[PDB]
Amino acid sequence: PFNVVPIHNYPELMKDTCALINAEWPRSETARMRSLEASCDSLPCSLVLTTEGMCRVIAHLKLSPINSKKKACFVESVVVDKRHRGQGFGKLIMKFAEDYCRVVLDLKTIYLSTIDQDGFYERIGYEYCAPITMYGPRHCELPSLQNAKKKYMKKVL
Ligand SMILES: CC(=O)SCCNC(=O)CCNC(=O)[C@H](O)C(C)(C)COP(=O)(O)OP(=O)(O)OC[C@H]1O[C@@H](n2cnc3c(N)ncnc32)[C@H](O)[C@@H]1OP(=O)(O)O
Prior knowledge:
Substrate binds at residues 27, 32-35, 67, 77, 113. The chain has 157 residues and is of the alpha+beta class. It has helices spanning 14-24, 29-37, 89-104, 118-123, and strands at 2-6, 45-51, 57-66, 69-80, 109-114, 127-128, 151-156. Helix 1 crosses helix 2. The longest helix has 16 residues, at 89-104. The chain starts with a strand and ends with a strand. Acetyl coenzyme *A is lined by residues 24, 75-80, 85-91, 112, 114, 117, 119-120, 123.
């Protein structure tokens, strides 16, 4: 009754997926579209949880490459539709992503950073780890986007 699919195989879901993400972290629709359009059959890849008929996008996560780690990825923008939270759908899509990374992508580790929901990831098997940057040296983070509450976690697949 539910499916998890890469967004690039079902672009008709992109508009609903943008609204899902933007309802949580407000950005332009175009900015979210650029991210969804980057999804491909390696990395990065956006996965969406939907109903059987694909008439509602229940959840979304994005898997991003890590410049210094060819056998790992970073998961970000994990969001479940506000109508359907607390019902196991976040757990569902995260477990699917882990199988997907291990089996389809042959990856060994998933990393993430969070500010307030490390208790969610701890419950589903993630562990705190040392800091790690998604980008390589050819990237400068805007200082206004740094936050002291950022905690890092990983799960060995
Ligand atoms: C890397 C990043 O993207 S961090 C930002 C994470 N995303 C967000 O904050 C966006 C808004 N929030 C959401 O979309 C959702 O609430 C999520 C993704 C945080 C969790 O999805 P949900 O569907 O609501 O959680 P889910 O039903 O699957 O519950 C998983 C378990 O973790 C627990 N749990 C859920 N959220 C939290 C939390 N914030 N803190 C501690 N424990 C939690 C639940 O009790 C549940 O326990 P159980 O396995 O024993 O039944």
